[PDB]
From a paper:
[name] is a newly identified m6A RNA methyltransferase and is highly conserved in multicellular organisms. [name]-mediated m6A4220 methylation in 28S [name] promotes ribosome assembly and translation, which in turn impacts cell proliferation and tumor growth. Distinct from what was observed for all other m6A methyltransferases, [name] is organized into four domains, with three flanking zinc finger domains packed around the MTase domain, forming an integrated RNA-binding platform. Through structural, biochemical, and enzymatic characterization of [name], a recently reported [name] m6A writer, this study reveals the molecular basis for the [name]-mediated m6A4220 modification of 28S [name].
Author numbering: 28 to 440
Write the structure that this text describes.
């Protein structure tokens, strides 16, 4: 029994309102309510823990509040915008970037970074590609910053163009953001705006207030307040809500329920003020995620189907290309956009499967008994008829269990 009440507000951690966890174990007869950190899995980075009954005293809470104020990024958002306007107006031979600090450098505070490792002659080309200048925060427990491979990212910007979107709400996709901006600015009158939402405050010194928001994705928190929140609200509400799509690449291993709750808050911002009669539209969404999360994702967004495009990364914890060659990427796209409207590059090994009106991989065989090109892995799958589905070729149909699974599994029933 959780008579859990959303009415009352969580305590505040450095990364915005904590989330409530409850443990049920040891016979499922005891409960424990506590507020943990919304966007840090292990306690090693955000060591927040408070029993719900536990109430902070005046002094102890003052300490908590000051600590939260202290853990904030060392530059205000406003300071970032001002430093940027001053930076892009220096000669090339005076644009420096400190790599040990991940900070753009104004000529006056070079001395403080003298004995650091500093990169010189930062061109505007680099400034408009921050994903290639800052090192990626690859820790799986906090950021999981795995950046798209150039080929796949260019595919995504081209797909968003051909579909006919002018605004792209980029929650957790820095590289896609920057490439959208470069395809809108250079050599094309195609207008595409992009609004990066991310917890990586390092991207604040590269985009002005209209293009970036310091944003926590697990609790729907704008670190800079209502001004930033309203930047986001206007970016959704523009053009009566038309011409907008939200692309997300959340950290692959993180809780997946609060993600859906945050995404639904965003959709709620987009649906406000829209015609009551015309309430049959949903906000077009790309949820980029490894394929084995489908069951969970479609449990929260019934209107989502999985495209067969293999999204490739420069770096990832799920696959790194071996000496034999390149291993395949488990990460796919999940959309409410009809997959028959989405055309995959035929020059990458992608063909249109007429039975399941959508594009599929070149090595993907079409299973005629669940009516879809079913081989998600790099191999050829098999169709079990008692489970009425296709399982990976290493799985077997177990007796007594009566459902498909690997040898060396736990038997049930
Ligand atoms: N709690 C959180 N709130 C907002 N953004 C977060 C977050 N946790 C991780 N992120 C961001 O989400 C991104 C996931 S890595 C995916 C990046 C994207 N595929 C690209 O290549 O451009 C990281 O950049 C990280 O900064
Ligand atoms: Zn430095
Ligand atoms: Zn097929
Ligand atoms: Zn099948
Ligand atoms: Zn079976
Ligand atoms: Zn079994």
């Amino acid at each position: 029994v959780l008579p859990l009440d959303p009415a009352v507000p969580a305590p505040l951690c450095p990364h915005g309102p904590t989330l409530l966890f409850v443990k049920v174990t040891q016979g499922a007869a005891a409960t424990r309510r506590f507020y943990a950190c919304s966007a840090c899995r292990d306690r090693k980075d955000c060591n927040f823990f408070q029993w719900e009954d536990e109430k902070l005293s005046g002094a102890r809470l003052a300490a908590r509040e000051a600590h939260n104020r202290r853990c904030q990024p060392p530059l205000s958002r406003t300071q970032c915008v001002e430093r940027y306007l001053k930076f892009i107006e220096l000669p090339l031979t005076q644009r420096k970037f400190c790599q040990t600090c991940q900070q753009l450098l104004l000529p006056d505070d070079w001395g403080q970074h003298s004995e650091h490792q500093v990169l010189g002659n930062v061109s505007i080309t680099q400034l408009r590609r921050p994903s290639q200048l800052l090192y990626p925060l690859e820790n799986a427990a906090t950021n999981a910053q795995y950046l798209f491979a150039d080929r796949s990212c260019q595919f995504l910007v081209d797909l968003l163009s051909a579909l006919g979107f002018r605004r792209v709400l980029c929650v957790g996709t820095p590289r896609l953001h920057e490439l959208i901006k470069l395809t809108a600015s250079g050599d094309k009158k195609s207008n595409i705006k992009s609004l990066l939402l991310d917890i990586d405050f390092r991207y604040s010194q590269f985009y002005m207030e209209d293009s970036f928001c310091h944003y926590n994705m697990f609790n729907h928190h704008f670190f800079d307040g209502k001004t930033a929140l309203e930047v986001c609200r206007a970016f959704l509400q523009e053009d009566k809500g038309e011409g907008i799509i939200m692309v997300t690449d959340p950290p692959f291993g993180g809780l997946v329920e609060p993600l859906a709750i945050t995404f639904k808050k965003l959709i709620a911002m987009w649906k406000e003020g829209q015609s009551q009669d015309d309430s049959h539209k949903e906000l077009p969404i790309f949820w980029i995620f490894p394929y084995f999360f489908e069951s969970r994702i479609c449990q929260f967004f019934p209107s989502f189907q999985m495209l067969d495009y293999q999204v490739d990364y420069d770096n990832h914890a799920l696959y790194k290309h071996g000496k034999t060659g390149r291993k395949q990427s488990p990460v796919r796209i999940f959309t409410n956009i009809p997959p028959n409207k989405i055309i995959l590059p035929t020059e990458e090994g992608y063909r249109f499967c007429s039975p399941c009106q959508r594009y599929v991989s070149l090595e993907n065989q079409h299973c005629e008994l669940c009516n879809s090109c079913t081989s998600k892995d790099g191999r050829k799958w098999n169709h079990c008829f008692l489970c009425k589905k296709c399982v990976k070729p290493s799985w077997i149909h177990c007796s007594i269990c009566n459902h498909c699974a690997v040898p060396d599994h736990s038997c049930e029933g």
